[PDB]
Amino acid sequence: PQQYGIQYSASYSQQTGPQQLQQFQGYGQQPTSQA
Amino acid sequence: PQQYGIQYSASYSQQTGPQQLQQFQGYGQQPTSQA
Amino acid sequence: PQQYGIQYSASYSQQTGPQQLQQFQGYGQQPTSQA
Amino acid sequence: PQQYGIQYSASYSQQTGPQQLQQFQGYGQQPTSQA
Amino acid sequence: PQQYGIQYSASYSQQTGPQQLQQFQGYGQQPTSQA
Amino acid sequence: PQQYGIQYSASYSQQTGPQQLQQFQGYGQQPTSQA
Amino acid sequence: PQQYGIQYSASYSQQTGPQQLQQFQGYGQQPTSQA
Amino acid sequence: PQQYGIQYSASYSQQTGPQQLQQFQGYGQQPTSQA
Amino acid sequence: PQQYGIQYSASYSQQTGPQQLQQFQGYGQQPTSQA
Amino acid sequence: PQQYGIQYSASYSQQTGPQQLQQFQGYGQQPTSQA
Amino acid sequence: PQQYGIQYSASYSQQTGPQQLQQFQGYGQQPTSQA
Amino acid sequence: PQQYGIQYSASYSQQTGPQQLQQFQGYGQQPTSQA
Amino acid sequence: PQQYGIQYSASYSQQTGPQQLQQFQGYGQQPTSQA
Amino acid sequence: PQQYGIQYSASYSQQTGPQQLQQFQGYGQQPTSQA
Amino acid sequence: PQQYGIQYSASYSQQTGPQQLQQFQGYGQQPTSQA
Amino acid sequence: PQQYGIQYSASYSQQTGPQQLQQFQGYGQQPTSQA
Amino acid sequence: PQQYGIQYSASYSQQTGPQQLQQFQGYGQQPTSQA
Amino acid sequence: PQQYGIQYSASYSQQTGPQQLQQFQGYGQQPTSQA
Amino acid sequence: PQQYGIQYSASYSQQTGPQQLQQFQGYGQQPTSQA
Amino acid sequence: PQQYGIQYSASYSQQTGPQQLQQFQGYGQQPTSQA
């Protein structure tokens, strides 16, 4: 099992804003609750 | 099992706004609740 | 099993707004509840 | 089993608004409930 | 089994509004309920 | 089994409004209920 | 089994309104209920 | 079995209103009920 | 078995109103009920 | 078995109103009931 | 001067196809030309 | 001068296809030209 | 001068397809040209 | 001069597809050109 | 001059697809050109 | 001059897809060009 | 001159996808060009 | 001149995806160019 | 001249993803170029 | 001239992801270039 978020190869990246990368491998849970 | 979010190859990327990448491999749950 | 979100090859990308990429491989659940 | 969201090859992309890409491979459920 | 969302080849894309791409491969369910 | 949403080849695309592409391959269900 | 939503070849596309493309390959159900 | 929604070849398309393309290949059901 | 919705070849299309294309290949059912 | 909805060849089309194209190939049923 | 497109009062509406409603109040012109 | 597109009062609406509502109040022009 | 697109009062709405509402009040022009 | 796009009052809305609302008040022009 | 896009009053809204609301008040122009 | 995009009053909103709201008050221009 | 994007009053909001709000008051221009 | 992006009053907000708010008051220009 | 990005009053906010707020008051320019 | 980014009054804020607030008052320029 291989998991790759972002890959660049001879490329140009310009990122001016906010960026979020969340990875779960296996048994991942992301619960959000607002009571 | 291979999972790839974004791939660039000899490319140009300009990203000025917000960006979110969430990966789940295996057994992933993303529950959202508002009671 | 291969899963690819976005691929660029000798391309030009300009992204000025918000962007969301969510990947589930295997057994993925995205429940949303509003009681 | 191969799954590809978006592919660019020697192309030009300009995306000014919001963009959502959600992928499920295998056994994916996206339930939305409003009680 | 191959699944392709959008493909560009030597093309020009300008997308100014909101865009949604949801892929299900295998056994996918998208239920929406409003009680 | 191959499934292709949209294909461009040496073409020009200008999309100013909202766009939705939903793909189901295999055993896909999209139920909508309003009780 | 091949399924193609929209194909462009050396063409010009201008789309100013809302657009929906839903594909089912295999065993697809789109039930809508209003009780 | 091949299924093609819309094809353009050296053509010009201008679409200003809403557009819906729904494809079913195999065993597709689109029931609508209003009780 | 081949099924083609609309084909353009060196043509000009201007579509200002709403447009619906629904394809069923194989065993397709479109029941509408109002009790 | 080939099924063609509409074909254009070096033609000019201007469509200002609503348009519906429904295709059934194989074993298609379109029942409408009002009890 | 009052102009009403469609009115429902304790009624049940099921609309499965495309629908277009265009209203002009005052001095409205809808010319269509194909030269 | 009052202009009303669609009105619902204690009613049930189920709309499964594409829908377009364009309103002009005052001095509205909707010309379409294909040269 | 009052302009109302759609009004709901104690009603139930289920809209599964694409929907477009464009309003012009005053001096509105919507020209479409394809040369 | 008052302009209202959509109004809900004690109502239930379920919208599963793409939706576009464009308002112009005063002196609004929406020209679309494809040369 | 008052302009209201969408209003909810004691209502329930469930929106699962893409949504676009563009407002112009005063002297607004939305030209789209594809040369 | 008052301009209101979306208003909620004692309401429930569930929005699962992409959403775009663009407001122009005064003298606003949104030109899109693809040469 | 008052401009309001979104207003909530004793309401419940659940937003799971991407969201874009752009406001221009006065003399605002949003040109997009792809040469 | 008052400009308000989003307002909450005794409300509940749950935002799980990316969000962008851009305000221009006075003389604002947002040009995007891709040569 | 007053400019307000987001306001909360006796409210509950839960923000799990990326968020961008850009304000320009006076004479603001946000040009993006990709040559 | 007053400029306010975010205001909280007797409120609860939970922010789990990345957040960006950029303010320009007077004569502000945010150019982004990728040659």
Residue numbers in the entry:
A (entry chain S), B (entry chain O), C (entry chain K), D (entry chain G), E (entry chain C), F (entry chain B), ...: 265 to 299
What do the study's own words say?
TFG functions in the early secretory pathway by regulating the transport of secretory vesicles between the endoplasmic reticulum (ER) and ER–Golgi intermediate compartments (ERGICs). To perform its role in clustering vesicles, TFG self-assembles into homomeric cup-shaped octamers via interactions encoded in its N-terminal Phox and Bem1p (PB1) domain and a subsequent coiled-coil motif. Within this region is an LCD (residues 237–327) rich in proline, tyrosine, and glutamine that functions to further polymerize these octamers into larger assemblies and phase-separate. Mutations in the TFG LCD are associated with degenerative neurological disorders such as Charcot–Marie–Tooth disease type 2 (CMT2) and hereditary motor and sensory neuropathy with proximal dominant involvement (HMSN-P).
The mC-TFG-LCD-P285L fibrils have two distinct polymorphs: a narrow, untwisting fibril (making up the minority of fibrils) whose structure could not be determined, and the major polymorph, which consists of two identical protofilaments related by a pseudo 21 screw axis, forming a class 1 zipper interface (parallel, face-to-face, up-up packing). The fibril has a pitch of 877 Å, a left-handed helical twist of 179.02°, and a helical rise of 2.39 Å. The disease-relevant mutation P285L is present and buried in the protofilament interior. L285 is a member of the longest β-strand of the protofilament core, fills in the space left by the glycine residue across from it, and forms a hydrophobic interaction with I270. Water molecules resolved in the interior of the fiber core reveal that L285 forms a barrier between solvent-accessible surface area and a glutamine zipper. Q283 is interacting with three water molecules, while the zipper made up of Q267, Q287, and Q289 is protected by L285 from solvent infiltration. In the mC-TFG-LCD-P285L structure, L285 forms a hydrophobic interaction with the isoleucine residue across from it (I270), which helps stabilize the fold of the protofilament. Besides this similarity, the portion of the core from G/V269 to P/L285 has a distinct shape in each structure and also the mC-TFG-LCD-P285L fibril core has several extra C-terminal residues resolved (Y291–A299) and these residues form both intra- and interprotofilament interactions. The shape difference of the 269–285 segment also contributes to the presence or absence of Y291–A299 in the resolved fibril core. This is due to the fact that, in the mC-TFG-LCD-P285L structure, residues T296–Q298 form a short polar zipper with residues Q278–T280 on the opposite protofilament. For the mC-TFG-LCD-P285L fibrils, fibrous aggregates were visible up to 80°C and disappeared only at 90°C, although even at 60°C, the fibrils appeared bristly.
